[PDB]
Amino acid sequence: GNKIHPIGFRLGITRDWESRWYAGKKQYRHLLLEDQRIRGLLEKELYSAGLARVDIERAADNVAVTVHVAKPGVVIGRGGERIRVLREELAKLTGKNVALNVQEVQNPNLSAPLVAQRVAEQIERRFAVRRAIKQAVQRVMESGAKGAKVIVSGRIGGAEQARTEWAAQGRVPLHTLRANIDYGFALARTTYGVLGVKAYIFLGEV
RNA sequence: CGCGGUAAUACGGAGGGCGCGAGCGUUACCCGGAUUCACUGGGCGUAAAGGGCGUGUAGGCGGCCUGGGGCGUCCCAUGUGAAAGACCACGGCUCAACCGUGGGGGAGCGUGGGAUACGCUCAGGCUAGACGGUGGGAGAGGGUGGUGGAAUUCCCGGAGUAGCGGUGAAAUGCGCAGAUACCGGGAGGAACGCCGAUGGCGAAGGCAGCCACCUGGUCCACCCGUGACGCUGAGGCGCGAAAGCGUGGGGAGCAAACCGGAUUAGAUACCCGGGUAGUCCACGCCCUAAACGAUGCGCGCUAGGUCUCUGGGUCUCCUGGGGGCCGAAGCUAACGCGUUAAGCGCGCCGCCUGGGGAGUACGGCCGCAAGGCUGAAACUCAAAGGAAUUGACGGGGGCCCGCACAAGCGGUGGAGCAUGUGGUUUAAUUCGAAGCAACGCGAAGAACCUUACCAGGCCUUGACAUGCUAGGGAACCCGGGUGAAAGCCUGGGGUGCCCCGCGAGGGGAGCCCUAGCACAGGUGCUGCAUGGCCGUCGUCAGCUCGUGCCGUGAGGUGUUGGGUUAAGUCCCGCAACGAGCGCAACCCCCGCCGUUAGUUGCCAGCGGUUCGGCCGGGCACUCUAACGGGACUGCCCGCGAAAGCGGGAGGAAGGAGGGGACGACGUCUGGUCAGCAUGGCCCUUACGGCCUGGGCGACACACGUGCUACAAUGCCCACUACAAAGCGAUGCCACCCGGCAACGGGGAGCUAAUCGCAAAAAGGUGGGCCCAGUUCGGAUUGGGGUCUGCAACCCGACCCCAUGAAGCCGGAAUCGCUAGUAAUCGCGGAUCAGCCAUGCCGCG
RNA sequence: GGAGGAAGUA
RNA sequence: GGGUGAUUAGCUCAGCUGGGAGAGCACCUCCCUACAAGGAGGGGGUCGGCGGUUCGAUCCCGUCAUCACCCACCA
Ligand SMILES: [Mg+2]
Ligand SMILES: [Mg+2]
Ligand SMILES: [Mg+2]
Ligand SMILES: [Mg+2]
Ligand SMILES: [Mg+2]
Ligand SMILES: [Mg+2]
Ligand SMILES: [Mg+2]
Ligand SMILES: [Mg+2]
Ligand SMILES: [Mg+2]
Ligand SMILES: [Mg+2]
Ligand SMILES: [Mg+2]
Ligand SMILES: [Mg+2]
Ligand SMILES: [Mg+2]
Ligand SMILES: [Mg+2]
Ligand SMILES: [Mg+2]
Ligand SMILES: [Mg+2]
């Protein structure tokens, strides 16, 4: 077991942070405090739409929160009795300049978590792992991709053992910088217990 | 075959689906499938199978030509082959089954007639097969008798002393009673060094000194003879390694069994000290085998190349007989065989039919016994077996490398102290961590809480979250008594927001307290049930794919071979050619420079200077942080083809310039339920929760990692310069005074290239100490202080008067380190009310 | 390259 | 009684014809390895007690004590 966080190795170059603001000396935590629950609030409320990203725009007092979901037709509400009441009911913990965005998605099956999200959702239902990833790592490559890799591990079949799995076609040069590869963090509470659904999706270079 | 070890298309039921249907299934039997008794239609190198070999009777089989008889054989006719059976047609039952009428095939035998290619037999001829005659050839083929030398062992004489012998090591053992080693003499046995080999000989078993007598087998040439006399061979008969046996001997060495020594957990063994049978000879037995080339004999045909043994022929030439070695086609499951077949055929012999039982039991023939030959079955298993592929593993080798061995330094192990660890104990000394991967590790926070441990006190819908019922109330501030604290009881206030009503007065959302709940909660258990994260191999250099090729196929090649490098890095070659993950490189810090920009810096040029970069002033320089050029074996002198190497110039640096981060497929069923999430078991009047105190610092011990040293390159005192990085407003602390000192009061500047922490030590000068247990070291301990927080005994510093211990260079061992590295000297950070910070991470 | 003729322990 | 001889660690035992008691096994620990071979430190002794010579005794000398062997003298 090795290979540290690819994004954690990216980070300070290529893909920039999942947030964006300077912070002063003793106000860092003070902002990070409620910054995290913002994310933690939605990673099980906004889920049934496929969440993969959440920026945070700040500088002073005013905060601009941008979400990156693929299925917005349900988070927006029948006319606003969601997206505009989610804002108002978001200040209740942090009286800040309530701002929001919703960035569209043209090709869902190209974001690493969305797969791992789809897989776990598909793993929870009694489905065929090896043959729910083979379909997956193919429809990834099908959507104009040029490489992929989706590793899962746990109690496959509920048997007492715990072998991981494989489902990959092509190149995933994790060790290179310009590669630009997104990484998926999933989780699956199940009958037997807890899984570990990962995913790599190579994309391009330069 | 197997399924069921929680989520069953196999079990029991249903719904449904499949197949048959007045039937459907089970069981039993016959044939098949079973090319698995092989006539069609098999095998015997390694799978079950070649007799241990030879000789040979009956039998089977047989070269060329000519003639006869026609026994087998073939052809035609005739008889038989009954009917019913099978076959074809036509008809009778209302079809069909059933039946009827009729017509052929005909295996087989008898008779007649005919044919003679083949097999048989008779007569005759021929020369390849076979044998013989002449001349020769080689040989560990064999039996008998003798004879030679070296070496072990023993006996005798002389000389000489303190050990010999044996093993990984020692011991049993021998030895002052004269050994081991020596010289002289003598005895007695077995077996033959070099030649000697991979060679020769025989049927096999087997055969190795020399000479001789007898003796077998084979081979070459001579154109002589016999003229198919040939081959195989059931039964029989003979030979038959070693061991064992009987009777007589011989016995130097070795040595089963027996005894002792030692290793061991024990050693009925391997190693050693003795040692009987035996191995040796004559005779007579068992007759067994990895008797193996695991390959029966005989003959013919199917390419070669190549060393050699042995004949012959006017000869690096031809030819005959053998033993080895690669390989044509062919064969095999492959390995492999290959003119000496496992190839293509013929003849004959023995043998085989899953493994275990079993080479057994019975019967029989042998043998003195040990045993041998012949040679089954009941029962049981769903495999046993052979070859080859991948991988793992190895107390198999080979190569490459790494502070792994060596050259050098410094240090642990030697003393005292900090930390952690094992044990020991206390009531608790929480848990985890276990060679390399634990032990200055989770801890980068063990005075209380942290805290998970002990003891006591107390709380139980709570310290928390969601939801419901009921009383009081909103909320929220303040206090007291007691009680160690927590907790318990009580008091003063105060009284909001929405549906009405001004009003006396109904209601509701939130929040709080008291009661019933649903509940949550647990550092409880399983890292062997997990997710995630981490270490090791290991920065090792490997992990694989597409096409092609080799193989029946698994698979191999590619990745292997030589060389080179840090490297699967690269080159040559290669039935391979390319690629993906990995090395590298794209990222960061340093070495160089350009520009941009000037609140640090600058008289480098000037103008005031309390002669300070303090100022005016300026941005080359200092420094700072953004993008960029630059180093690619680029060029040249040579070397090895090749990559590469000795260079050299220019360049700052040259062959990776020097560090960081990055760690593939995979093992370690590795570490972590105690960072967190989570299955399952458990705890829920407590295994949950709060407080005071105590404990992980306890100590006869031992280890791990560090700290000062045990001193003259040394140690004190005074004076005199240089940092790089990092950090800080409710904090950093200048500076002033006070303090003989840690520090106290006042307070400048700084939310930060400015202010500060902050004085850096080794360094330089100058004086002392002149080898001492020292003016080296500070452990322990008495007394005395300031310094933070509710509170400093176990369980803080710094400082003063001291007390001043071992320590004189450290055994077996053992540790890191190949360059600004090692050592030495010092400067920061990170958690924080205080608190585990000499450990860690950074800097010079 | 093939062929012939130096380990302590579950 | 007469004379030969011992006896030392816990043990089987050396010391040389006088000059600081020692090699093995066992015991404690440390090492390389996990065991066990194997090394380095330390402890361990009334040289059987008692004496005499000697500057100085494990050894020179004389009685005891516990043995062992041999030859009797016991009315
Ligand atoms: Mg980057
Ligand atoms: Mg069961
Ligand atoms: Mg046949
Ligand atoms: Mg075999
Ligand atoms: Mg027979
Ligand atoms: Mg007839
Ligand atoms: Mg001797
Ligand atoms: Mg005997
Ligand atoms: Mg006999
Ligand atoms: Mg021919
Ligand atoms: Mg059978
Ligand atoms: Mg008899
Ligand atoms: Mg330079
Ligand atoms: Mg594990
Ligand atoms: Mg000091
Ligand atoms: Mg002072």
List the domain boundaries for chain A: 16-106, 107-206
Protein CB footprint (7 Å) on chain B nucleotides: 6-7, 529-538, 580-587, 661-666, 668-671, 677-679, 728-730, 751-752
Does residue A128 reach within 7 angstroms of strand B, measured from its CB?
no
For the CA of A62 and the C1' of B233, the distance in angstroms is: 117
Whether any strand B atom is under 7 angstroms from the Cβ of A72: the reply reads no
| CA A2 to ligand 8 centroid distance, Å | 73
- The experimental method, as deposited, was X-ray
Residues A154 and A119 sit within 8 Å (Cβ to Cβ)? no
**What are residue A81's phi and psi, to 5 degrees?**
-70, 30
CA of A191 to the centre of ligand 1 (A): 40
Count of CB atoms within 10 A of residue A76's CB?
Answer: 17
Closest nucleotide C1' to the C-alpha of A196:
B531
> Which CATH code is given to the segment(s) A107-206?
3.30.1140.32
C-alpha span between A193 and A187 (Å, rounded): 10
CA of A2 to C1' of B538 (A): 12
What's the Å distance between residue A99 CA and nucleotide B268 C1'? 94
Distances (CA, A) of A105 to A51, A68, A109, A150, A161: 11, 8, 10, 21, 39
Whether the CB of A192 is less than 7 Å away from nucleic strand B comes out as yes
Residue A64 is inside which H or E element, if any? strand A62-69
Contact A26, A16 (CB under 8 A): no
Characterise A134 by phi-psi region: left (phi > 0), alpha (psi -120 to 50), beta (else): alpha
- Provide CB contacts within 8 A for A128, sequence distance 6+: none
Give Cβ neighbours of residue A139 (< 8 Å, ≥ 6 apart): A109
A118 C-alpha to ligand 3 centroid (Å): 69
Q: How far apart are CA A200 and CA A166, in angstroms?
A: 12
- Separation of alpha carbons A196 and A155, rounded Å: 10
CATH number of A16-106: 3.30.300.20
